[PDB]
Ligand binder design. Sequence first.
Ligand SMILES: *C(=O)[C@H](Cc1ccccc1)NC(=O)CCCCCN
Ligand SMILES: [Cl-]
Ligand SMILES: [Cl-]
Ligand SMILES: [Mg+2]
Ligand SMILES: [Mg+2]
Ligand SMILES: [Mg+2]
Ligand SMILES: [Mg+2]
Ligand SMILES: [Mg+2]
Ligand SMILES: [Mg+2]
Ligand SMILES: [Mg+2]
Ligand SMILES: [Mg+2]
Ligand SMILES: [Mg+2]
Ligand SMILES: [Mg+2]
Ligand SMILES: [Mg+2]
Ligand SMILES: [Mg+2]
Ligand SMILES: [Mg+2]
Ligand SMILES: [Mg+2]
Ligand SMILES: [Mg+2]
Ligand SMILES: [Mg+2]
Ligand SMILES: [Mg+2]
Ligand SMILES: [Mg+2]
Ligand SMILES: [Mg+2]
Ligand SMILES: [Mg+2]
Ligand code: NA
Ligand code: NA
Ligand code: NA
Ligand code: NA
Ligand code: NA
Ligand code: NA
Ligand code: NA
Ligand code: NA
Ligand code: NA
Ligand code: NA
Ligand code: NA
Ligand code: NA
Lengths: 56, 81, 82, 143, 46
Amino acid sequence: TGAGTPSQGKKNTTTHTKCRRCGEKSYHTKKKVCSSCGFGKSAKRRDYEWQSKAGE
Amino acid sequence: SWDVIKHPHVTEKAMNDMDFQNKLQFAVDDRASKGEVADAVEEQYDVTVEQVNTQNTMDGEKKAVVRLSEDDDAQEVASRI
Amino acid sequence: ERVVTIPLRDARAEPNHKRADKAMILIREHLAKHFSVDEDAVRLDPSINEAAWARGRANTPSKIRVRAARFEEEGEAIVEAE
Amino acid sequence: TDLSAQKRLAADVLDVGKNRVWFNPERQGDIADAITREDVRELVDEGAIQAKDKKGNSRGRARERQKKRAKGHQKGAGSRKGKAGARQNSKEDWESRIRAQRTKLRELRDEGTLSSSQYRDLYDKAGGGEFDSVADLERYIDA
Amino acid sequence: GKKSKATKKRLAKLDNQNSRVPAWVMLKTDERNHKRRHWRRNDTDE
RNA sequence: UAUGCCAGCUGGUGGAUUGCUCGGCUCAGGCGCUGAUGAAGGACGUGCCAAGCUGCGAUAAGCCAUGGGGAGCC
RNA sequence: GUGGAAGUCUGUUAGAGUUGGUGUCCUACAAUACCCUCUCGUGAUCUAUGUGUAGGGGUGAAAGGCCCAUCGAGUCCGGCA
RNA sequence: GUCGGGUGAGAACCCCGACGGCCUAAUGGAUAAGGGUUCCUCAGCACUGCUGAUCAGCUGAGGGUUAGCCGGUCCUAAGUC
RNA sequence: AGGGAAACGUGAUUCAACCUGGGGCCCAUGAAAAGACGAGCAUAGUGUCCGUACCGAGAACCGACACAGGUGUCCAUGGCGGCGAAAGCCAAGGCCUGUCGGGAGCAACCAACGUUAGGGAAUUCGGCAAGUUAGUCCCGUACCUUCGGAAGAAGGGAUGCC
RNA sequence: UGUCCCAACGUUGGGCCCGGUGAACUGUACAUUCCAGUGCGGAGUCUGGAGACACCCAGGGGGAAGCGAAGACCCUAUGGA
Ligand SMILES: *C(=O)[C@H](Cc1ccccc1)NC(=O)CCCCCN
Ligand SMILES: [Cl-]
Ligand SMILES: [Cl-]
Ligand SMILES: [Mg+2]
Ligand SMILES: [Mg+2]
Ligand SMILES: [Mg+2]
Ligand SMILES: [Mg+2]
Ligand SMILES: [Mg+2]
Ligand SMILES: [Mg+2]
Ligand SMILES: [Mg+2]
Ligand SMILES: [Mg+2]
Ligand SMILES: [Mg+2]
Ligand SMILES: [Mg+2]
Ligand SMILES: [Mg+2]
Ligand SMILES: [Mg+2]
Ligand SMILES: [Mg+2]
Ligand SMILES: [Mg+2]
Ligand SMILES: [Mg+2]
Ligand SMILES: [Mg+2]
Ligand SMILES: [Mg+2]
Ligand SMILES: [Mg+2]
Ligand SMILES: [Mg+2]
Ligand SMILES: [Mg+2]
Ligand code: NA
Ligand code: NA
Ligand code: NA
Ligand code: NA
Ligand code: NA
Ligand code: NA
Ligand code: NA
Ligand code: NA
Ligand code: NA
Ligand code: NA
Ligand code: NA
Ligand code: NA
């Protein structure tokens, strides 16, 4: 079975959804954790220094 | 504080229910229960509410089909507004 | 008006599963020529259609007797089975 | 005119498949104006709208065949397709035969013709598959 | 699928944002809805 | 002299160029914390008609007071 | 004779698999498709949903196979001009 | 598919009738996920539709989903926080 | 009561659903909890909240597309046929939207395919491709064998209708 | 038994003509070539001859060392894994 087009057919599972905390469609309803703001994992907001160029 | 009744839901279907079944249709606050809708309606129009059916609409609001008692006449209660 | 015998041998030149359609066209082109009228003006009564489709789309008869009449202000022919 | 909507309403009002509803070709204009279910029923009463009859397969030829076969014909080697055990289930057939034989022996015992010992003897032999049929059993009984 | 009350409110809003800029607004501004979303060609969130 | 080559003319296509700047970039002076009295952020609402943006919060492009301002405004 | 066992047989039952045609396609219907042929089809079977295992780590009846068209070390951004 | 006919400025493909066909574990009926208004009505054809279109899943505006006894809700599973 | 234009049947067989038993298997042992029963009857009041449209696919889902791909469940009891949930044909129901048409006996060439005399694998790396055989019953069945099998071995005969 | 001797005729969909829709690959320039020669030793374009009126339709692909891909072989780098 091709890993391409034919394997795209079974994709009717919902995972990422609109987050209650940040509003981004990044709340993983299976994990109950937002990949965008960290809701469900961290009280503090998810943020990293690598989201921008080192000197900026 | 929010009010229960927003305004009368007047459409063709709403008319048929009023002319043929003695029911008034309203757009109410979606936090309102059938009970709260029943009361509010009575206190505002001085009528006897017999039954209330609700529906959360694709317009984002709640719609209530309020049936009055044979003692009251929907057509008339609606005609004064 | 007159009674004419239309030969449908030329419908065999068209792929077999589609004779009926072709036949129906031959009939129209035949009346148009023999009655000096435009193919646009030839009207075929459903009788003819049913006659030609009698045995399905692939089994058309080799001939068909057709009664046609000519007249009016733009010239035309109305035809039917016989 | 476009009467497809009415077709859907007529089908439901008449309670029939859309493909069976008929609209009088001479009344498209009137049916076209039919907007409500009531408008439809009305046209129905005027016979402008009707339901064609559903066919059912004729079983005539089936019955003639059923007769020949019940009489014992049209079942020669050239007409069989399934394996023998397929045409008649051997376990099922044994239940048929052995029950008949046991019922037979059961009657002859109450009837008095057989002593509970002869019966027992015959019964065991039947379950042992000693008798091809009831007839064969009766025959054996008469020594 | 089964939608919740909140989900429904959001779908409702999206449908509403899907209307056109009213005719009068054209006259009032002396002269496009960039948020037009087709149910088939586009995909909503959640 | 068809098909056609080269250059130009009239019209087009295209959006370069020149002119223009409600935006940027950089430097400098001043200033500098907010939050359980629930912030920052987000959601959904809110207009006569209202889709976007802004504002605002069921008192919803707003309510009150004082000062300024002024014959206009929404 | 009865009984009805079996990683048993036949089988396009459903379903699973993918041998040959090195056919059709190969700016495709399709970034793995179509047709015929072929294998399995009561079992170490097939399948939906839920759930667990995470990157020098998983998972692997082991082909360096698979871990979202990405694998002899996934993807994203950063280190980084 | 064909012959007639309807509507329309315009009709091979929008609608009516007949004739002729296609689908039978599906091309029928009910649904899960998933989609999200695509449902119905009216008005339209600049866009979309492998041609055309008076048609439409398209464009615009309205309307439409009613529960003590169908689901959720409650319980606990692998397991998760 | 309802429904039907009307009649508004009676018996039978085979019997999905549903109910209830018996047997066999395991180096495999085939959830749990809430709840219900146990534990009567009248009358009355209460029963809020969320979902409910539509598609469910060769155009409403995933695959950038109205994509010949992919995508779970129930209808497995419609008729003939036959071993059959098989073929073929046909109902109910759906459809003419696996959506561009018109014309030329319609050439060459190409895709799928039918039939080819005599020869019969000479073709080719190779019988690749195609073909042959075929269902059912009766007869009959070698070497070998782990005694199970080999085996539908092979081979021979039959087969309709009335 | 059309795999072959050795091919023929036929069926259906294309192909061909017409209406409508309407891309892509590729393009330093010039370009009607052929035979020889020459040249970095594999030339439509240089040299000598020969041939050559222009445009168009269909074809099967000899050539453009045809299009497609900064050779995956081989070596080299004080490259990587
Ligand atoms: C030897 O002759 C190699 C073998 C090889 C190399 C790489 C991969 C698989 C096999 N063959 C070649 O080098 C052929 C080269 C083709 C060049 C064409 N222009
Ligand atoms: Cl439900
Ligand atoms: Cl028993
Ligand atoms: Mg992969
Ligand atoms: Mg409700
Ligand atoms: Mg047996
Ligand atoms: Mg709308
Ligand atoms: Mg087996
Ligand atoms: Mg098998
Ligand atoms: Mg799983
Ligand atoms: Mg290896
Ligand atoms: Mg519609
Ligand atoms: Mg319309
Ligand atoms: Mg429904
Ligand atoms: Mg389509
Ligand atoms: Mg021969
Ligand atoms: Mg040889
Ligand atoms: Mg040879
Ligand atoms: Mg072969
Ligand atoms: Mg020269
Ligand atoms: Mg290189
Ligand atoms: Mg190497
Ligand atoms: Mg190394
Ligand atoms: Na409202
Ligand atoms: Na969508
Ligand atoms: Na400051
Ligand atoms: Na606005
Ligand atoms: Na035995
Ligand atoms: Na295959
Ligand atoms: Na890694
Ligand atoms: Na980097
Ligand atoms: Na049957
Ligand atoms: Na069409
Ligand atoms: Na042949
Ligand atoms: Na060539």
